[PDB]
Every structure is written in C-alpha cells, then in structure tokens.
Amino acid sequence: IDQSVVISEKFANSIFAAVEHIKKQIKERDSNYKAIIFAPTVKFTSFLCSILKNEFKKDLPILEFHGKITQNKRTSLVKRFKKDESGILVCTDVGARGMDFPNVHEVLQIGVPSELANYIHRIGRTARSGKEGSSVLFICKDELPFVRELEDAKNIVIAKQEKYEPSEEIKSEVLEAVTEEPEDISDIVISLISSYRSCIKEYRFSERRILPEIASTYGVLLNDPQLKIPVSRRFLDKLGLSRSPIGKAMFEIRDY
Amino acid sequence: SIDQSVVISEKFANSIFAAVEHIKKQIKERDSNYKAIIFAPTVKFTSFLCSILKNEFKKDLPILEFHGKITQNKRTSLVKRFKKDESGILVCTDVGARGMDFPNVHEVLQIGVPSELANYIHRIGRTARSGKEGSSVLFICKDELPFVRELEDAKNIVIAKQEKYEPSEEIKSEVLEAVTEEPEDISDIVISLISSYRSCIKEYRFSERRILPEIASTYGVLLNDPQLKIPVSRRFLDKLGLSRSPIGKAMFEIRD
RNA sequence: GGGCGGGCCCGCCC
RNA sequence: GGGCGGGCCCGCCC
C-alpha cells in the first residue's frame, strides 16, 4: 500500500485537493477509476456526493453509502459496486459486513477517521490479493497531530507527505457547483464540529485552533471567509460554547 | 456449579408474578441477604419491572436499573455500586459486557427468553463465579417453550428442574395494585415486548399465531381486564405491518 | 446522586 | 422507510 498524506492550510481545502486528485486520476486512467473515499459524518458524506456528482457524474458512478442508508439499498449498491470496474464509493466508517471490493485502485480519506484503529481498516480495502494500491489522507494543518499519534500508537508511518494550496480556479469550479443552501451548509459543518470535538483528546488536537478552523468551513463554502455560523444564544448553550471565546470565533449569535 | 431451573406459566404476564413471589421467598429465607441479576427483553419492560420490585422490596433491597439507554456516567457508578453491594437486585437487559463481573451473586433470574440463544449462557455465567455456588431461574410461558428444546438441540443444555406455575389471586392483586403506571404506559411497554418477541420467532421456532396474541394480552392482564385489547390507529397498525392480519385483530382494537 | 444533548457504528425483525 | 436490542467516542446542567 503506497500511503501518502496531503496537507492543506484549511480543512475546507482538503475538499478541493481531493477533487483535483480525482480529476487527475480520471484523465490518466481514461475514466477507469475505482476508489473509496471516506468521510467523518453522514451529512458531509452526502455533501461530498453532490460535489463529486456535479464534477464526475458524466465520467463515473458516484455512490453514497452510510449508516442512514436503508438496508435494502445498502445490499444492492454493495453488489453493484462489487460489479463496477469504475466508480467512486463515498462512505463513512461503515462496518466491514460485506465490504470486500475487488480492483479498487485508491482509498481516499478527507479528514481524519473517528478513531485511530479505523485508519488501518480503511486502507485495507485496497492493495489486496496481490494487486497494488494507494492511500491518500487529505488533512489540514491542525489535524497533523493525528499522524504523530499513528506512529506512537499503532506504529505506522506515512512516507510521502506534501503540501497543497488550491488555485482560485478550482475553488470557483467547485463552489459554483454547490447547490446546497446556507441552512444545509450549517447543518453539515456543525456535524463536523461535533465529530472533531469528539476526537480531540485522543489525537492531542488544540481545541482553540481546530474548532474555529472546522467552523470556518462555513464561510469558505459560502464564499465569504469572514462570515461566521448563525445560531441562537440558546443553541450555543446547547453546545456548551456559550461563554467561550472559541464560540465567539466560530459563531454569530442571533437571539433577537 | 450452576443450578438451572425453569418456571412455566400459562401466560407471559404470569412470569412477572412468578418472579416476584420467587424473590419474596428468597428474601424471607435469606433475611434480605439477597443479591441477584434479573434480565429483561426490552428497556421499557426493564423499567416497569423496577417499579414493581421497588414497590415490593424497596425497604429490603436496593433495586438497580441498568440498560443501554442509561448514560455512561450513571452506568459507571452503579456498576461500581453493585460490585460493592452484598444485597440488591440488578434489573437489566442483555447489556455490556464491559466489565460486568459482579461477585457474590446468588441468582440470575430471566423473565422471558433472551434475544439470542447464545446469551442464555452469557447470563448464567454471572453466577456461580470463582468457586461459589449459584442458581438460574428461567421464567417463561407456555408459548415460549420451543426455546428450551432449541437449547438442547443447538447448545446441548438441559434444564433439570421444571415447574408449572399458576398465580394466586392474592399475588396478582398485590402486584397490580402497586403498579402506578397508566394505560398509555402499559401500552408502550407491551408493544416493546411485541416487537422484541416478533424479532426472535424464526430463531426459536415460535408460533406467530400464538405467541404475539399472548404477549399482547399482557395489556389486559395488567389493566385487570383480560379481554381488553390494545388501542391503536389503523395507521399505526400499518406501520407494524399487521393491518390485514387476523393476528392484528386478535391483538389490537382499531381506532382509525 | 439526578437531569439533558451530540458524532459514528453493529445485530435482529417488519 | 419503520421497529427492537446493543457498542465506541464527545459535550452540558443541577
């Protein structure tokens, strides 16, 4: 397994990095690309499918797959993806139940996994039964402590590292194809905020840095970097970031 | 070291009385030095059992409620507490088993069959530990019996002591009077049992035509009107998929 | 001791 | 789509 890790300045930029990477692979392989792309939350998984569809609906079949997909539909698109020699399966850390897919070229990871163990489980889906394979972990600056934890804990090193700053061209291409409304982007980012908040201690993250960055994804996606997430003073209490400067950095109070 | 027995009652509901009587006896004989685990199929039913057992033995013993929908903090504490207690009854579902090794447990009671054939073993493991003696009592009803035959054929276990049980009018009144729950709650409770039992029919070779009406009849029995059926909407009956079924007519009273 | 919310997943049934 | 049971991680209040 040829493991690599693409670091970006902002969490959001991991999205672009991934889209670009996919475009390159499709061009080189003439649309003979079959990859699994993992995501931290269900809402963010669906969000990724939209983008990937708007980008590569024509070239590849984009498959959404997570816990909140009904069992019938889950059984059918596992069978389908087993058959497909081309397509991208976007999913969360779903159970291995019957997740043995042949001829998978790459496993992509946008953002760290919920728990340290899953990193191993994810890359297992490629380079099996003799075939070659690659893994690409797209993270941001503030997620880095995860890689260190992979070594100290599970004793795994990622040989190839690389920085990434997105072109103004790619940012516009992606964001333009985003049809979701602000209320949906908020739901999406909040699910990320909660996910990342849950794995701070485990990955020795810096709360004061990581949360604001994740939240900033809201503005970045709505093409207004300095626009913060609108919430009620009550909702903020419900998150427990009410009297916190981190909260003032992440959110815009609107209780009037 | 495990003295296994099984008390068969005519109706599911009667297993409740059988258990309460059993517990009273053990308390009398042991002068309240009784420590037992009593397993239950659903959460709501577990809580319902705690109410009864509290009204019956709050003075003599500590009654502890323990299931998946108990918050992790409260779960850590009452595990510690029960480990320490030399007297008390833990009412729970097939929870855990993350460190569920409780010392000096005298009996494991089981009201109704377990969800999985395997769990029967797991449950009785909690007694007769590290040399000490222990006993198991399985309270079931006529229609659950196929479970015992399945235990032999599959798991190759035989329960030596059997006993048929028909409750006195005295005990029925003692228990039911202490029940503070309202009819809407008794409906919620029985429905959880209806669904639990419906999920383990094929596995235990139960007769749907017999077992479900019996479980549902628990509603009347508890409200002291044996022929009173469970009130539900034609919509709710469709949600369960027992709409055009005679079994549904036997279990429910339609109010569309 | 009591109350409440959030992220991910698994098993079984209709 | 719904139901029953369960696992892991996180936050808040008294």
Swiss-Prot record, chain A:
The keyword Membrane appears for this protein: no
UniProtKB keywords: ATP-binding, Helicase, Hydrolase, Mitochondrion, mRNA processing, mRNA splicing, Nucleotide-binding, RNA-binding, Transit peptide, Translation regulation
Biological process according to GO: Group I intron splicing; Group II intron splicing; mitochondrial RNA processing; mitochondrial translational elongation; mitochondrial translational initiation; mRNA processing; regulation of translation; RNA folding
UniProt keyword Hydrolase, yes or no: yes
GO molecular function, a single term: RNA binding
Location in the cell: Mitochondrion matrix
GO (cellular component) term, any one: mitochondrion
Domain Helicase C-terminal: 14-171
Main location, first listed in the record: mitochondrion
Role summary: ATP-dependent RNA helicase required for mitochondrial splicing of group I and II introns. Specifically involved in the ATP-dependent splicing of the bl1 intron of COB. Also required for efficient mitochondrial translation.
Comment text on domains: The Q motif is unique to and characteristic of the DEAD box family of RNA helicases and controls ATP binding and hydrolysis.
Family under the similarity heading: Belongs to the DEAD box helicase family. DDX18/HAS1 subfamily.
Miscellaneous notes: Present with 10300 molecules/cell in log phase SD medium.
Protein name: ATP-dependent RNA helicase MSS116, mitochondrial
Source organism of this protein record: Saccharomyces cerevisiae (strain ATCC 204508 / S288c)
Name of the gene encoding the protein in the UniProt record: MSS116
Residues of the full protein shown: 342 to 596 of 664
